[PDB]
Swiss-Prot record, chain A:
Subunit architecture: Binds to host ACE2. RBD also interacts with the N-linked glycan on 'Asn-90' of ACE2. Cleavage of S generates a polybasic C-terminal sequence on S1 that binds to host Neuropilin-1 (NRP1) and Neuropilin-2 (NRP2) receptors. Interacts with host integrin alpha-5/beta-1 (ITGA5:ITGB1) and with ACE2 in complex with integrin alpha-5/beta-1 (ITGA5:ITGB1). May interact via cytoplasmic c-terminus with M protein. May interact (via N-terminus) with host bilirubin and biliverdin, thereby preventing antibody binding to the SARS-CoV-2 spike NTD via an allosteric mechanism.
Lineage: Viruses, Riboviria, Orthornavirae, Pisuviricota, Pisoniviricetes
Function text: Attaches the virion to the cell membrane by interacting with host receptor, initiating the infection. The major receptor is host ACE2. When S2/S2' has been cleaved, binding to the receptor triggers direct fusion at the cell membrane. When S2/S2' has not been cleaved, binding to the receptor results in internalization of the virus by endocytosis using host TFRC and GRM2 and leading to fusion of the virion membrane with the host endosomal membrane. Alternatively, may use NRP1/NRP2 and integrin as entry receptors.
Included stretch of the parent chain: 350 to 399 of 1273
Protein name: Spike protein S1
Curated annotation (Swiss-Prot), chain B:
UniProt name for this protein: Spike protein S2'
Effect annotated for changing L38F: In strain: Omicron/BA.1
Domain of life: Viruses
Coiled-coil intervals, chain numbering: 6-49
Annotated consequence of substituting D7N: In strain: Delta/B.1.617.2, Mu/B.1.621
Organism the protein comes from: Severe acute respiratory syndrome coronavirus 2 (2019-nCoV)
Primary role: Subunit of the fusion protein that is processed upon entry into the host cell. Mediates fusion of the virion and cellular membranes by functioning as a class I viral fusion protein. Contains a viral fusion peptide that is unmasked after S2 cleavage. This cleavage can occur at the cell membrane by host TMPRSS2 or during endocytosis by host CSTL. In either case, this triggers an extensive and irreversible conformational change that leads to fusion of the viral envelope with the cellular cytoplasmic membrane, releasing viral genomic RNA into the host cell cytoplasm.
From Swiss-Prot, chain D:
Region ranges (Disordered): 21-43
Gene source species: Severe acute respiratory syndrome coronavirus 2 (2019-nCoV)
Outcome after substituting T49K: In strain: Omicron/BA.1
Subunit structure: Binds to host ACE2. RBD also interacts with the N-linked glycan on 'Asn-90' of ACE2. Cleavage of S generates a polybasic C-terminal sequence on S1 that binds to host Neuropilin-1 (NRP1) and Neuropilin-2 (NRP2) receptors. Interacts with host integrin alpha-5/beta-1 (ITGA5:ITGB1) and with ACE2 in complex with integrin alpha-5/beta-1 (ITGA5:ITGB1). May interact via cytoplasmic c-terminus with M protein. May interact (via N-terminus) with host bilirubin and biliverdin, thereby preventing antibody binding to the SARS-CoV-2 spike NTD via an allosteric mechanism.
Physiological role: Attaches the virion to the cell membrane by interacting with host receptor, initiating the infection. The major receptor is host ACE2. When S2/S2' has been cleaved, binding to the receptor triggers direct fusion at the cell membrane. When S2/S2' has not been cleaved, binding to the receptor results in internalization of the virus by endocytosis using host TFRC and GRM2 and leading to fusion of the virion membrane with the host endosomal membrane. Alternatively, may use NRP1/NRP2 and integrin as entry receptors.
Residues of the full protein shown: 499 to 547 of 1273
Protein's UniProt name: Spike protein S1
Length: 50, 49, 49, 49
């Protein structure tokens, strides 16, 4: 956690409906946006901090 | 010369301009644009905003 | 019915997804109660259910 | 493995969405139609509806 990895996502089409097939989580916690609407939006960049 | 008539016109115009500019206020919502709230949130979450 | 964990959040008014669109849709004016419980001991087989 | 649910490890991934004035680079799967001008249409430019 102190050296958390960060990855930058750009120049791609992001389908957020396959994120359920990668990790056995129960639900998103989305602030400022709703999890079901993510596929209808364009973002300038995405950052995945793990 | 005609200060009062121009003052009346100015007061009415200023009231209308203020009414228009009030549309850019968030009022505690995430955004002041109705379309952005509708597009970025589900119905249950967008109803509050 | 039976779903998996990810989709339990979709059994609610105003939701969208595979389940809420093509399988089981609830009205936006829903008045009721949803009860979901894990059934891994019953609905899961070693080779797959 | 014998620790309680509060003391067990949890893997966390945080997705931060940079939505600036720059041209969009990350988009959802959405087919784009032809551009229609001089007609009343429902337009959707990069999620701006």
């Amino acid at each position: 956690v102190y050296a958390w990895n960060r990855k930058r996502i750009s120049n791609c089409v992001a389908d957020y409906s396959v994120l359920y097939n990668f990790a056995p989580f129960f639900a998103f916690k989305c602030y400022g946006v709703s999890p079901t609407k993510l596929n209808d939006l364009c973002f300038t960049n995405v950052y995945a901090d793990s | 010369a005609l200060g009062k008539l121009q003052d009346v016109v100015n007061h009415n115009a200023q009231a209308l301009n203020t009414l228009v500019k009030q549309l850019s206020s968030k009022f505690g919502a995430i955004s002041s644009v109705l379309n952005d709230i509708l597009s970025r949130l589900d119905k249950v979450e967008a109803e509050v905003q | 019915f039976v779903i998996r964990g990810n989709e339990v959040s979709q059994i609610a008014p105003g939701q969208t997804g595979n389940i809420a669109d093509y399988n089981y849709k609830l009205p936006d004016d829903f008045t009721g109660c949803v009860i979901a419980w894990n059934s891994n001991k019953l609905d899961s087989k070693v080779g797959g259910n | 493995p014998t620790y309680g649910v509060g003391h067990q490890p949890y893997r966390v991934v945080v997705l931060s969405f940079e939505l600036l004035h720059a041209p969009a680079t990350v988009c959802g799967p959405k087919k784009s139609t032809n551009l229609v001008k001089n007609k009343c249409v429902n337009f959707n430019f990069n999620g701006l509806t």
